Ligand binder design. Structure first.
Ligand code: 1VF
Ligand code: ZN
Lengths: 47, 161
């Protein structure tokens, strides 16, 4: 596990080319996330 | 100490979690190589993950962050897809999950797009796809994602391609 950048608790990956992509995030301490929902699913074949 | 409680499809909480799952699918620049080709999911089950110790562990750290950031945890609900979902629900997230080759360093990665997290269910780059058919676009096999409560605190902004 690396360290968060000094003065910060996380890193935000902002998209800067694909205008439709949403943000991604990185935490460097396991205690900063709680796995609240487990979702079971299938991807669906487009028609 | 983890128990899983099934939500009914008639429950507003089931419905709001399904909607975030469905409405955050996008197309991916790999044409579907890693997560498969799809526009939407068939949601089979949504379970609430209940562990008192892991919860208290999260809320303790949340309070620490919040107090370092003018009483603002900057808490989000984000997706995580992983081959190690069983370890996470029972033991929580920890340094064994740090993604050494990740573009923002060795940390634990979460996505606003459910379909981004889908790309990692069967491993980095989709691995070899499902255990049963070796198909990264398998439409048969049941997949699992976590929808997680995440404390961002003061977040470092990385503008990136
Ligand atoms: C100890 N190493 C952890 C990283 N490894 C993973 O398989 C791994 C699992 C999930 C992810 C993951 C899961 C995500 O949901 C995710 C979301 C946005 C961006 C990147 C993301 O990456 C990454 C790597 C290999 C083992
Ligand atoms: Zn399969």
């Amino acid at each position: 596990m690396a360290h968060s950048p000094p003065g910060h608790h996380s890193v935000t990956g902002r998209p800067s080319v694909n205008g439709l992509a949403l943000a991604e995030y990185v935490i460097y301490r396991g205690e900063q996330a709680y796995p609240e929902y487990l979702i079971t699913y299938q991807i669906m074949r487009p028609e | 100490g983890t128990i899983l409680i099934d939500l009914s499809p008639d429950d507003k909480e089931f419905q709001s979690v399904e909607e975030e799952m469905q409405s955050t699918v996008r197309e991916h620049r790999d044409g579907g190589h890693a997560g498969g080709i799809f526009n939407r999911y068939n949601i089979l089950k949504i379970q609430k993950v209940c562990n008192k110790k892991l919860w208290e562990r999260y809320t303790h750290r949340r309070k620490e962050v919040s107090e370092e950031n003018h009483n603002h945890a900057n808490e989000r609900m984000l997706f995580h897809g992983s081959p190690f979902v069983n370890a996470i629900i029972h033991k929580g997230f920890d340094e064994r999950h740090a993604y050494i080759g990740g573009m923002f360093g060795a940390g634990i990665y979460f996505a606003e797009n459910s379909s981004k997290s889908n790309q990692y269910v069967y491993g980095i780059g989709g691995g070899t796809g499902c255990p049963v058919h070796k198909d990264r676009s398998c439409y048969i096999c049941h997949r699992q994602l976590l929808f997680c409560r995440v404390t961002l605190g003061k977040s470092f902004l990385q503008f990136s391609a």
